[PDB]
Design a protein around this ligand. Structure first.
Ligand code: YSA
Ligand code: YSA
Lengths: 411, 415
């Protein structure tokens, strides 16, 4: 039983009429969906949780529908959001829709027969829907009394200064209708999402009964968090131009022990048997396994190898294996960086990079043999960089002591 | 000062930025509007209060716009309504729209130059409006925190079983946008309505500022009520719903505590004439005659001179007993709603007509009441208990009016 398997990974927050869903799942392939709103040019790690859950259902033989909210992204989901969001333009949302659709696509199989993935966009039905049609055909089925009692919008209905527009309050009807629309178009009988989506999902379940006299189900995944109560993603984007594969990999390497086994369950396709065996062995490595799996999953074999090669070069101080693209990752977000004019001396580099507070202090630090230039020791306080030390004519990696790095990017 | 004149008739509940509105009114003609939703095939007396107020503004030189809610009638106004209304069909609402627009038209002047009245319909702009456009362009300007606390809908938001749909909750936004539309299309700067419309009006004022960067105003008329606290069922303007006779009699029977206020609300008599009529009644030493004046004015206004003459002829014939002056059309007003009526098969005796009309409990009782000379047939006394009606007594071959005592009537409609 797939629900039982997901419950064992800790991937089930809530599920509607669970016994019936397990029976329908047991009978044969179902169509299911999860929606993703375009509120940025990329998804982050949080979005990856239900995205991989769509693939977990596909691996079990079910048909995943990945919806991108071209219409809902023009409205804004208020669910457990403390503040009203500014509206985004139609041009910006369309740009984001395209980027998200393309980012989701490699996570699912679009060519595996009957259960092949389908990309959907709710702008296809809301983009031309008349307002009186929406209010009469959809709105009459929604009770404002029940809407104001939804946990997701309750904290917004106490004081107007921390309030909600009619625009964001109508959001629940759009996602509610999306479920009914996918049920009629594709026979979708299940919607998944994170726990904040519970109220938007149950509205679609109810609306599908009222509009199409069909029974549909809901399943939420817990919102993934760190055990120490801090905010998850200290954000971690899927786009390599926002979070480099190296930074992505390092985020996983540095997972706390209290989080590492839970993260392996949420973010990898490793069996529950191997994760438990990995946990027992360490009680009498997991961060390394987690980093390898998720980095290869998001950034591919090439991405994982670049992240490992950069990590190794920084640990060893030997930079010969680094390519120009590797240095681009370091400058982006890998190590602290400073832009400098060619001709600057070593003292000025240490001051401008904030590795040293003054030229006088930097002189003593250099003379003490604390500084490396591309991994090589340089103890002449009066030194000027050689042209060959400007790797790819652009980069020079400084290190103070055994671990304090700074990348000089030459103008 | 038009606002002050309306305040003296008791026709002003609330006014936004009153000094600025009075200054705008004194500068020259303005364009104003009032909306009427199609929830029935006719307007009633309540709807007549703001409709006549549109005419009062027109008489002062202003330009009235009478909007009929082709779109809003497909949504439903929840304002101060205890229960959620069922949605009406597009075909039914269209039929009602046509009937209401035609019923409204004779009350305003459509041919008096620059301030000629205009007929409008909000279906013109909502019929082709996309949902994302409405939600973004209009909806972003509305706070749900403020909406749920509006007096017109707050009572609906405590019991789920006695609740409000998103459909009816969205209504305030539609009427709000209508004011922005009429401001842009016709330079409408004022909306009037009854006091239940205050919140729908102020939403339009705020939205016009946000969308068109224009200053507009609101003025409400008090909801006309009775002094005894009872409900002001309905008295319709359509003669096929409320006959001119019944309409006239409703005004005749106005309570003394209500008659002068009703003159101010429902007629175009000057405040000086109404005050002189109250003064005369206060010093006459007899019962008031103002009800007669009110009945003549409003019946002539709504049903014309012909309607008034029919109501008076029917009243006079019932009072005199002599029905010779009654036409077939007059008897049809009586059968519709003038007096209680019963359908009976020709051949029924007087005793059975008294029992079936519920004028008597039994034939045995009917026998004694007939013998006591308490029964009239078409105003003529009939004291024979064993009497059968004559063919000549079935007026126009199908009407006989029975009366027990001085006022217990029943029209027999012969089959
Ligand atoms: N930290 C996290 N852990 C687990 N899941 C997480 C998460 N952060 C985000 N998610 C989930 O990732 C998904 C996409 O996030 S989202 O774009 O903010 N979601 C939304 O705004 C949905 N209303 C989108 C939507 C859903 C269905 C529709 O028919 C239409 C639109 C949601 O299911 C959300 O719960
Ligand atoms: N007893 C009464 N006394 C005085 N005025 C009364 C009344 N009963 C009804 N009215 C008024 O008669 C007018 C029409 O009544 S109604 O058809 O119920 N009105 C409505 O439902 C409004 N929402 C119509 C409307 C108004 C403006 C728009 O842009 C669109 C529609 C309103 O101004 C109402 O306040």
């Amino acid at each position: 039983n797939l629900i039982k398997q997901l419950q064992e990974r800790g991937l089930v927050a809530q599920v509607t009429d669970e016994e019936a869903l397990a029976e329908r799942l047991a009978q044969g392939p179902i169509a299911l969906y999860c929606g993703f709103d375009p509120t940025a040019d990329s998804l982050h790690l949080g979005h990856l949780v239900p995205l991989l859950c769509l693939k977990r259902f596909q691996q079990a033989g079910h048909k995943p529908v990945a919806l991108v909210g071209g219409a809902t992204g023009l409205i804004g989901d208020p669910s457990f959001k403390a503040a009203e969001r500014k509206l985004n333009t139609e041009e910006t949302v369309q740009e984001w829709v395209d980027k998200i659709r393309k980012q989701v696509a490699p996570f699912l199989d679009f060519d595996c027969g009957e259960n092949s993935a389908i990309a959907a966009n709710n702008y296809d039905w809301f983009g031309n829907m008349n307002v009186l049609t929406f209010l009469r055909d959809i709105g009459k089925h929604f009770s404002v009394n029940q809407m104001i009692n939804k946990e997701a919008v309750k904290q917004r209905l106490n004081r107007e200064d921390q309030g909600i527009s009619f625009t964001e309050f109508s959001y629940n009807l759009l996602q509610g209708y999306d479920f009914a629309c996918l049920n009629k178009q594709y026979g979708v009988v299940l919607q998944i999402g994170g726990s904040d989506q519970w109220g938007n999902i149950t509205s679609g379940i109810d609306l599908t009964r009222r509009l199409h006299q069909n029974q549909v189900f809901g399943l939420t995944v817990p919102l993934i968090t760190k055990a120490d109560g801090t905010k998850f993603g200290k954000a971690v984007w899927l786009d390599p131009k926002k979070t480099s594969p190296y930074k992505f990999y390092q985020f996983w390497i540095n997972t706390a022990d209290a989080d590492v086994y839970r993260f392996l369950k949420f973010f990898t396709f490793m069996s529950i048997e191997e994760i438990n065996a990995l946990e027992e062995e360490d009680k009498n490595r997991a961060q390394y396994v987690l980093a390898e799996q998720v980095t290869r999953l998001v950034h591919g074999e090439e991405g994982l190898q670049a992240a490992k090669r950069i990590t190794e070069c920084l640990f060893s101080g030997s930079l010969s294996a680094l390519s120009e693209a590797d240095f681009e990752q370091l400058a982006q977000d890998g190590v602290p960086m400073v832009e400098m004019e060619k001709g600057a001396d070593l003292m000025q580099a240490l001051v401008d990079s904030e590795l040293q507070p003054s030229r006088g202090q930097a002189r003593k630090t250099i003379a003490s043999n604390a500084i490396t230039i591309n991994g090589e020791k340089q103890s002449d306080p009066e030194y000027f960089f050689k042209e060959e030390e400007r790797l790819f004519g652009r980069f020079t990696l400084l290190r103070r002591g055994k671990k304090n790095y700074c990348l000089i990017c030459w103008k």
